[PDB]
Each structure stands twice: as C-alpha cells, then as structure tokens.
C-alpha cells in the first residue's frame, strides 16, 4: 500500500497553505511586482483573536489605531472595537 | 499636609484668651513627628522573561500587596508618602494583554 492518492478537498492543512502560496505566486507574477503580499501566518488564529480582544477591552492594539482573506472577516469585528 | 500644622496652633490660641478658666492646654509631643505615630502606610525580577503560568500567579499576588499603598514585589508603589496622590509602576515588559 502507499495510499489512494488524496483529492483536492481531502488534501489540506499543508496543501491549503501550499495552495495559498501558489495562488500568491500567481498573483505576483500576473501583477509584475506592484503588490507585495506579507506573511499569511504570523499572525495565526489565536494571536489575532487576542489582538482583536484587546480592542474590546477598550485600548487599541497592533493592527488598530485611534490566510489572505482574513482581512475580510477581520474588518467586520475590528470596526466594533474601534 | 503642611498647611494643617499652622491652623491647629492658632485655633488653640483663640480659646486660651477667651476662657480665663482654661488650664494647662497641651503641646503636641515632638516624638509623634520624629517617630511614626501618624502615618503607617509609608527579589525584584523582570516579569516579562518569566513563563506564563508563573506570570499570572505572580502578578496577582504582587498587585494585592501593592493596593495598600506600599511596594509589593514586581509592582512598586512610587514614593510620595503624602497627599491625595499615589501612582504605582508595574514592570514595563509585562505582556500587553495582561498589563492593560
């Protein structure tokens, strides 16, 4: 046995990050280098949850002032603390 | 603080001259100022380098001492030893979520 060779949906948690990295390479080549994407990890899930929770305490934090789609989820809950 | 020491003596003086039967009025003893008989409310490691599950226990235990008006261990009571003002300094390198 070696296995039944994973599908795209069965592949994940490594192939997800891989698939993301390849999509970013696609976007950067099709742009020419006028975008400059940052690290998708750092922040991870729990670090970001604590960073947004600090704004609900009532003080701003790292991404605040007075994984690439995470910004789209992020703004909806960021606006409440600001 | 300093303004009281004046008033107290003068309020004494009004009542020695108005009463001709006032007898042997007190002087406030000197030792109460030289030695503490009025105010009784007046190792140190950086908390940021410590593990987490020691940082929580330590910061709670130290702030409980600090509240009374005197130094704890890792949070210090800044010296004024007087008026309605008092400030406390927790260590600056404490993790931001806990320190706020």
Curated annotation (Swiss-Prot), chain A:
Subcellular location: Cytoplasm, Cytoskeleton, Microtubule organizing center, Centrosome
Pathological condition linked to this protein in its record: Microcephaly and chorioretinopathy, autosomal recessive, 1: A syndrome characterized by microcephaly, cognitive impairment, underdeveloped retina and choroid, and epilepsy in some patients. The more anterior parts of the retina, near the periphery and pars plana, have a grayish hue and diminutive vasculature similar to retinopathy of prematurity. Visual impairment becomes evident during the first year of life.
Task performed by this protein: Component of the gamma-tubulin ring complex (gTuRC) which mediates microtubule nucleation. The gTuRC regulates the minus-end nucleation of alpha-beta tubulin heterodimers that grow into microtubule protafilaments, a critical step in centrosome duplication and spindle formation.
Subunit structure: Component of the gamma-tubulin ring complex (gTuRC) consisting of TUBGCP2, TUBGCP3, TUBGCP4, TUBGCP5 and TUBGCP6 and gamma-tubulin TUBG1 or TUBG2. TUBGCP2, TUBGCP3, TUBGCP4, TUBGCP5 and TUBGCP6 assemble in a 5:5:2:1:1 stoichiometry; each is associated with a gamma-tubulin, thereby arranging 14 gamma-tubulins in a helical manner. Gamma-tubulin at the first position is blocked by TUBGCP3 at the last position, allowing 13 protafilaments to grow into a microtubule.
Family to which this protein belongs: Belongs to the TUBGCP family.
Protein name: Gamma-tubulin complex component 6
Residues of the full protein shown: 305 to 405 of 1819
Swiss-Prot record, chain B:
Full protein stretch here: 150 to 258 of 902
Domain of life: Eukaryota
Disease: Cortical dysplasia, complex, with other brain malformations 15: An autosomal recessive disorder characterized by global developmental delay, variably impaired intellectual development, speech delay, facial dysmorphism, microcephaly, and varying degrees of cortical malformations including pachygyria, thin corpus callosum and subcortical band heterotopia. Most patients have generalized seizures.
Similarity annotation: Belongs to the TUBGCP family.
Protein name as catalogued: Gamma-tubulin complex component 2
Subunit structure: Component of the gamma-tubulin ring complex (gTuRC) consisting of TUBGCP2, TUBGCP3, TUBGCP4, TUBGCP5 and TUBGCP6 and gamma-tubulin TUBG1 or TUBG2. TUBGCP2, TUBGCP3, TUBGCP4, TUBGCP5 and TUBGCP6 assemble in a 5:5:2:1:1 stoichiometry; each is associated with a gamma-tubulin, thereby arranging 14 gamma-tubulins in a helical manner. Gamma-tubulin at the first position is blocked by TUBGCP3 at the last position, allowing 13 protafilaments to grow into a microtubule.
Role, per record: Component of the gamma-tubulin ring complex (gTuRC) which mediates microtubule nucleation. The gTuRC regulates the minus-end nucleation of alpha-beta tubulin heterodimers that grow into microtubule protafilaments, a critical step in centrosome duplication and spindle formation. Plays a role in neuronal migration.
Localisation: Cytoplasm, Cytoskeleton, Microtubule organizing center, Centrosome
């Amino acid at each position: 046995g070696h296995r039944e060779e994973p599908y795209l949906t069965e592949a994940g948690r490594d192939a997800f990050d891989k698939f993301c990295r390849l999509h970013q390479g696609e976007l950067q080549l099709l742009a020419g280098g006028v975008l400059q994407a940052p690290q998708p990890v750092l922040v991870k899930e729990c670090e970001l949850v604590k960073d947004v929770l600090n704004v609900l305490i009532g003080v701003v934090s790292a991404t605040f002032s007075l994984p690439e789609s995470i910004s789209s989820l992020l703004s909806e809950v960021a606006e409440y603390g600001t | 603080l300093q303004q009281s020491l004046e008033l107290k003596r003068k309020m004494l003086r009004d009542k020695q001259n108005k009463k001709n039967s006032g007898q042997h009025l007190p002087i406030f003893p000197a030792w109460v100022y030289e030695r503490p008989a009025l105010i009784g409310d007046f190792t140190a490691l950086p908390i940021g380098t410590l593990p987490l599950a020691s940082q929580e226990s330590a910061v709670v235990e130290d702030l409980l001492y600090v509240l009374v008006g005197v130094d704890g261990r890792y949070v210090s009571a800044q010296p004024l030893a007087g008026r309605q003002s008092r400030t406390f300094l927790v260590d600056p390198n404490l993790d931001l979520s806990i320190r706020e």
